[PDB]
Amino acid sequence: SSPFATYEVTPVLGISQRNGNVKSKGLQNWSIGYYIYMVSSAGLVNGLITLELAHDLTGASGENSLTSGLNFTFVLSPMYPIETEVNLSLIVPPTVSPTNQNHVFVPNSNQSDVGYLGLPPHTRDNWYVPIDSPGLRLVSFMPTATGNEKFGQGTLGYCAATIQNTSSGTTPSDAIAFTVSLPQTSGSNWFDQNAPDTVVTTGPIPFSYQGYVYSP
Amino acid sequence: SSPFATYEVTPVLGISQRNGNVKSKGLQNWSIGYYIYMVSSAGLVNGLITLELAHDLTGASGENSLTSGLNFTFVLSPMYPIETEVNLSLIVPPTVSPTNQNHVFVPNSNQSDVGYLGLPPHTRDNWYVPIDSPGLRLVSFMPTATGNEKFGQGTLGYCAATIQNTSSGTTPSDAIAFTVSLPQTSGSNWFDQNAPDTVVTTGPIPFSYQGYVYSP
Amino acid sequence: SSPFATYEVTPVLGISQRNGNVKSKGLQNWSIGYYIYMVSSAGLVNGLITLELAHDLTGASGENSLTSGLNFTFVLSPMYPIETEVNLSLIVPPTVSPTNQNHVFVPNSNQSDVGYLGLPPHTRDNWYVPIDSPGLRLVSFMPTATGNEKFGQGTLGYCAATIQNTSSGTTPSDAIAFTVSLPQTSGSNWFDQNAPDTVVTTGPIPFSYQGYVYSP
């Protein structure tokens, strides 16, 4: 019997089925493709997150990706759907091994001491996380885009988050916030025309945090 | 029987009991709260370190945290207390699983080849590690502070260290040095008044190194 | 029976036997010492890579390391030597546990979606990877050098790579590219005189990626 707990989530048709949701810095809701794989070893979680945007984004009148960059937040509630109430980024249910060991991947209470990132409970609410938010663990990477779209050095910030003011009045388990900045060097305005074939990926970004201990 | 070795250390009353010691860039001894959790998988150690300072620091006459930042070093001797002689940061004994497998977490001899960070053996000695010291692995994060205290992007550097010139003349097992820079954007001078309720945390910072192989 | 798969590779006489090959930014072939250790946990690979150069490098006429830095690429084909055709960096066969589980450490097809880093198949070919190449995961560290040689903050980029246009016409398994930038602060021109005693090491740099699942 495996000593590991595992967590895997991606759209049923894979990362190119962009049916997740991210909150932009402009408070727009963007479609996202995601692939997340995490392994728990004696309560320590190591993970990889991949996020893919298509060139179909909504920005403000006169806003240009070439000046603003692509800045957005993905939030994972590992207890979903054992806890059904919170799913900001509209994930499908994860594959968890063993079955229903989702709580193993909830960030431990010590992942948010002194202060904590607090988020509202609904996809429509304002849960954009600034890239310089207190508590973020910061990672650097070069994204990859199709054709003539060129992106500079990207940043991901991640941390535990508490979800506040749920409709039921029940305290949800903690979530993990992933906030991304992709500065754009050249190409087109990602906020203007729908170009569904034109895609940028973060590639698989590593992260690590403390959850709860799985023991077989 | 678990395939993992684990190492956990924190003050008995938790990270808010700031009875550890860090060496500042000014060679002052500051009280610190710490929480360290490490897991060994076939000789590869993955860890999380959290460090918390209160607003009770000693600096030079006329020194201001708003100009100088908070720069300090924490040193972990994983063999403590099987080896009793070295404990620069004044930790309590760790919880190690299995019991007395502390040596699993000593950095491997190949973690310090060509040159090595060398440290003196006593808390009172000069074991401050500059943030640009040769051999550091560097990580970025946003710390979190109480109230109106605001900190910019922080840096942690970590590496294996040899301890030199022990009182017994016995060569101690290697230690791990963790050196931190917290630049401060706004708030108060952390070197002036005792404000014990005013706290900054690094949050849980990930790190990885090679130790010795545990096999059940 | 261990739940882990492990991968270890280094020259037979250790990292100071610099019989590996890296491709420089000038498209020169430099001798390198390497030590790589990786552990696979339910298909997630955590690794440490150490690279050592001696002061015996070939550069262009009039090129100076003090102005250019040391910029070079190491490529690991984890299937070697089960797949014999590809070995850009001239490694010796790795120690893999269990024996012949090399494919566990091949980066998963999802490590190179949207675009992919493509490399040629022969050591003599042009497989230098720019430090700002799309798809790199980026890490920071302070290297260590002997004597009066002083290096600033280094960068490593890593990612999955496909090998293209093999002599056999067989598609090799994917490789991992490791590209390094070591800016030099002071000391001598590493491109001029042979000083075999004069060495710079990256130290052990952590990295993480998704391979294939090993189950005992």
Side-chain angles (χ1 to χ4, degrees):
Chain A
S1 191
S2 172
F4 307 113
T6 69
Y7 179 114
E8 184 182 40
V9 75
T10 199
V12 185
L13 271 43
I15 190 165
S16 73
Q17 177 177 46
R18 308 193 186 85
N19 69 348
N21 194 108
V22 293
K23 191 67 66 156
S24 79
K25 183 174 168 177
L27 309 188
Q28 306 256 8
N29 287 253
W30 295 343
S31 296
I32 198 108
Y34 58 93
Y35 180 86
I36 296 164
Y37 190 64
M38 312 193 286
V39 180
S40 181
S41 300
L44 184 52
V45 180
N46 292 290
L48 296 164
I49 182 164
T50 305
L51 300 172
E52 199 174 283
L53 290 163
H55 189 300
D56 63 4
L57 306 186
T58 53
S61 47
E63 207 191 345
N64 196 330
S65 62
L66 285 162
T67 297
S68 286
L70 302 180
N71 296 279
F72 58 92
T73 306
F74 184 95
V75 179
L76 184 73
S77 289
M79 273 310 275
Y80 185 82
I82 297 174
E83 288 173 24
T84 61
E85 195 172 6
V86 185
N87 184 17
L88 290 173
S89 282
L90 302 178
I91 69 162
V92 298
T95 304
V96 184
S97 179
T99 304
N100 298 320
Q101 287 291 342
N102 299 50
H103 188 265
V104 165
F105 294 95
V106 171
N108 187 296
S109 58
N110 66 11
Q111 301 300 89
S112 62
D113 289 333
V114 149
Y116 63 88
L117 175 61
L119 297 175
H122 305 136
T123 298
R124 66 180 169 277
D125 296 336
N126 182 348
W127 45 275
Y128 176 68
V129 175
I131 196 63
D132 63 351
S133 288
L136 296 174
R137 280 68 281 278
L138 293 165
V139 191
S140 295
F141 59 92
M142 306 301 302
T144 309
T146 53
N148 300 301
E149 304 293 345
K150 304 300 172 189
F151 287 83
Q153 184 174 311
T155 311
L156 178 134
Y158 67 93
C159 65
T162 77
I163 311 298
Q164 303 173 319
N165 306 129
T166 47
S167 293
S168 76
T170 300
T171 308
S173 295
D174 287 357
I176 310 157
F178 303 91
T179 204
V180 182
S181 180
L182 309 180
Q184 190 193 356
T185 296
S186 64
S188 70
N189 185 0
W190 283 60
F191 303 143
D192 177 23
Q193 289 290 294
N194 207 311
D197 60 322
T198 295
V199 175
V200 58
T201 182
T202 62
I205 307 168
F207 63 100
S208 181
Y209 69 95
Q210 191 169 8
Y212 295 86
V213 172
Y214 170 66
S215 194
Chain B
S1 191
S2 172
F4 307 113
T6 69
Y7 179 114
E8 184 182 40
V9 75
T10 199
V12 185
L13 271 43
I15 190 165
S16 73
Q17 177 177 46
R18 308 193 186 85
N19 69 348
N21 194 108
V22 293
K23 191 67 66 156
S24 79
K25 183 174 168 177
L27 309 188
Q28 306 256 8
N29 287 253
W30 295 343
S31 296
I32 198 108
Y34 58 93
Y35 180 86
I36 296 164
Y37 190 64
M38 312 193 286
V39 180
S40 181
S41 300
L44 184 52
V45 180
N46 292 290
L48 296 164
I49 182 164
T50 305
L51 300 172
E52 199 174 283
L53 290 163
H55 189 300
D56 63 4
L57 306 186
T58 53
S61 47
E63 207 191 345
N64 196 330
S65 62
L66 285 162
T67 297
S68 286
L70 302 180
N71 296 279
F72 58 92
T73 306
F74 184 95
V75 179
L76 184 73
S77 289
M79 273 310 275
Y80 185 82
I82 297 174
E83 288 173 24
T84 61
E85 195 172 6
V86 185
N87 184 17
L88 290 173
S89 282
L90 302 178
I91 69 162
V92 298
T95 304
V96 184
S97 179
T99 304
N100 298 320
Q101 287 291 342
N102 299 50
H103 188 265
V104 165
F105 294 95
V106 171
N108 187 296
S109 58
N110 66 11
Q111 301 300 89
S112 62
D113 289 333
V114 149
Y116 63 88
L117 175 61
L119 297 175
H122 305 136
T123 298
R124 66 180 169 277
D125 296 336
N126 182 348
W127 45 275
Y128 176 68
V129 175
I131 196 63
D132 63 351
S133 288
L136 296 174
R137 280 68 281 278
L138 293 165
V139 191
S140 295
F141 59 92
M142 306 301 302
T144 309
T146 53
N148 300 301
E149 304 293 345
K150 304 300 172 189
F151 287 83
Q153 184 174 311
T155 311
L156 178 134
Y158 67 93
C159 65
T162 77
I163 311 298
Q164 303 173 319
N165 306 129
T166 47
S167 293
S168 76
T170 300
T171 308
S173 295
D174 287 357
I176 310 157
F178 303 91
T179 204
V180 182
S181 180
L182 309 180
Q184 190 193 356
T185 296
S186 64
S188 70
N189 185 0
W190 283 60
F191 303 143
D192 177 23
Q193 289 290 294
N194 207 311
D197 60 322
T198 295
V199 175
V200 58
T201 182
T202 62
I205 307 168
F207 63 100
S208 181
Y209 69 95
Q210 191 169 8
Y212 295 86
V213 172
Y214 170 66
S215 194
Chain C
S1 191
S2 172
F4 307 113
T6 69
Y7 179 114
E8 184 182 40
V9 75
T10 199
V12 185
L13 271 43
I15 190 165
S16 73
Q17 177 177 46
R18 308 193 186 85
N19 69 348
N21 194 108
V22 293
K23 191 67 66 156
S24 79
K25 183 174 168 177
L27 309 188
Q28 306 256 8
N29 287 253
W30 295 343
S31 296
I32 198 108
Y34 58 93
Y35 180 86
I36 296 164
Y37 190 64
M38 312 193 286
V39 180
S40 181
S41 300
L44 184 52
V45 180
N46 292 290
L48 296 164
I49 182 164
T50 305
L51 300 172
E52 199 174 283
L53 290 163
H55 189 300
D56 63 4
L57 306 186
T58 53
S61 47
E63 207 191 345
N64 196 330
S65 62
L66 285 162
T67 297
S68 286
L70 302 180
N71 296 279
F72 58 92
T73 306
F74 184 95
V75 179
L76 184 73
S77 289
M79 273 310 275
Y80 185 82
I82 297 174
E83 288 173 24
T84 61
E85 195 172 6
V86 185
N87 184 17
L88 290 173
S89 282
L90 302 178
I91 69 162
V92 298
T95 304
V96 184
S97 179
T99 304
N100 298 320
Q101 287 291 342
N102 299 50
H103 188 265
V104 165
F105 294 95
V106 171
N108 187 296
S109 58
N110 66 11
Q111 301 300 89
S112 62
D113 289 333
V114 149
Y116 63 88
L117 175 61
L119 297 175
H122 305 136
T123 298
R124 66 180 169 277
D125 296 336
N126 182 348
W127 45 275
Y128 176 68
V129 175
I131 196 63
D132 63 351
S133 288
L136 296 174
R137 280 68 281 278
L138 293 165
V139 191
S140 295
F141 59 92
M142 306 301 302
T144 309
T146 53
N148 300 301
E149 304 293 345
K150 304 300 172 189
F151 287 83
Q153 184 174 311
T155 311
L156 178 134
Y158 67 93
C159 65
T162 77
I163 311 298
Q164 303 173 319
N165 306 129
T166 47
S167 293
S168 76
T170 300
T171 308
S173 295
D174 287 357
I176 310 157
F178 303 91
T179 204
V180 182
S181 180
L182 309 180
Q184 190 193 356
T185 296
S186 64
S188 70
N189 185 0
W190 283 60
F191 303 143
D192 177 23
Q193 289 290 294
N194 207 311
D197 60 322
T198 295
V199 175
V200 58
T201 182
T202 62
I205 307 168
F207 63 100
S208 181
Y209 69 95
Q210 191 169 8
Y212 295 86
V213 172
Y214 170 66
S215 194

